[PDB]
């Protein structure tokens, strides 16, 4: 009963993410106007989301079977691709926010930095850092088997001590939820204060009409990002801090937060498609 509902949730979230990102990439690739800095950033975000969503159905099968039968190599590559896609997506969001801050708050001096070749270099740097930061995932992954023969794909941290779990989780929390979140918040705060502080134009309706929408968009993006990523990290940090016995409700909560962390990557194309005046035309 419980297993079927969660597996179908995994299936539907993966399908929605795949379809949304597929149509976004279809729109971007076909139209020739999409050779701009924002468009290439959105394309990198969309391909990262596509790969991240492709990484999920194996997790769905594992949850359904309550074991991982795909083999050690498949488990390792699945964990590696999951890590690379997750960190690529979060750092793509970070670089889009910092680039938007540079474009708006510092419009003139940023012309020397905002170049398509430089943007592609920064994209490659983002992918390289994402590959760098998932070394533990790609080194310590593998199958763990219990006393009943069931085997599950997870990270086999060497050493009988549990300090590796806490160290790894705090590292991923800092570099995958904390620094990106604070950078995005600061960048969008500066963007908002710059747009609102354009009062020397002494124009009417310039305090509400052209900035309430920007504030709402920023709030929506940050709120959906936090609401999708925070439950997962809260659950993981509680698990690696407070030893709680497993219960079916607890298992359901765990797989639900694991669905949410992909729901964020599913929602990003929705944001950039349903609320994008320059992109909805195509």
């Amino acid at each position: 009963t419980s297993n079927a509902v969660l597996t179908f949730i995994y299936f539907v979230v993966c399908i929605i993410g795949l379809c949304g990102n597929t149509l976004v990439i279809y729109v971007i690739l076909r139209y020739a106007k999409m050779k701009t800095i924002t468009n290439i950033y959105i394309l990198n975000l969309a391909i990262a989301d596509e790969l991240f969503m492709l990484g999920l159905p194996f997790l769905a099968m594992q949850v359904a079977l309550v074991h991982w039968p795909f083999g050690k190599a498949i488990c390792r590559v699945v964990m590696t691709v999951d890590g690379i896609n997750q960190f690529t997506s979060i750092f793509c969001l970070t670089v889009m926010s910092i680039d938007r801050y540079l474009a708006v708050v510092h419009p003139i001096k940023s012309a020397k930095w905002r170049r398509p070749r430089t943007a592609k270099m920064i994209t490659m740097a983002v992918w390289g850092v994402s590959l760098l930061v998932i070394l533990p995932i790609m080194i310590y992954a593998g199958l763990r088997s219990n006393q009943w023969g069931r085997s599950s794909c997870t990270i086999n941290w060497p050493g009988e001590s549990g300090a590796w779990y806490t160290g790894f989780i705090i590292y991923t929390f800092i570099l995958g939820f904390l620094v990106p979140l604070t950078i995005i918040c600061l960048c969008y705060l500066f963007i908002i204060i710059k747009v609102k502080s354009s009062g020397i134009r002494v124009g009417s309706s310039k305090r509400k009409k052209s900035e309430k929408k920007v504030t709402r968009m920023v709030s929506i993006v940050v709120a959906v990002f936090i609401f999708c990523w925070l439950p997962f990290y809260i659950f993981n940090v509680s698990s690696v801090s407070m030893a709680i016995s497993p219960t079916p409700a607890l298992k359901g909560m765990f797989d639900f937060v694991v669905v949410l962390t992909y729901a964020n990557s599913c929602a990003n194309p929705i944001l950039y498609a349903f609320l994008s005046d320059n992109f909805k035309k195509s």
């Binding site: 997790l59 219990n146 599950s152 779990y165 989780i169 698990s239 497993p246 298992k251 694991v258």
Partner: peptide, 12 residues
């Protein structure tokens, strides 16, 4: 071992 860790649940 931890039953809940990263994106996978293990009985251990």
């Amino acid at each position: 071992c931890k039953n809940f860790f990263w994106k996978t649940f293990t009985s251990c």
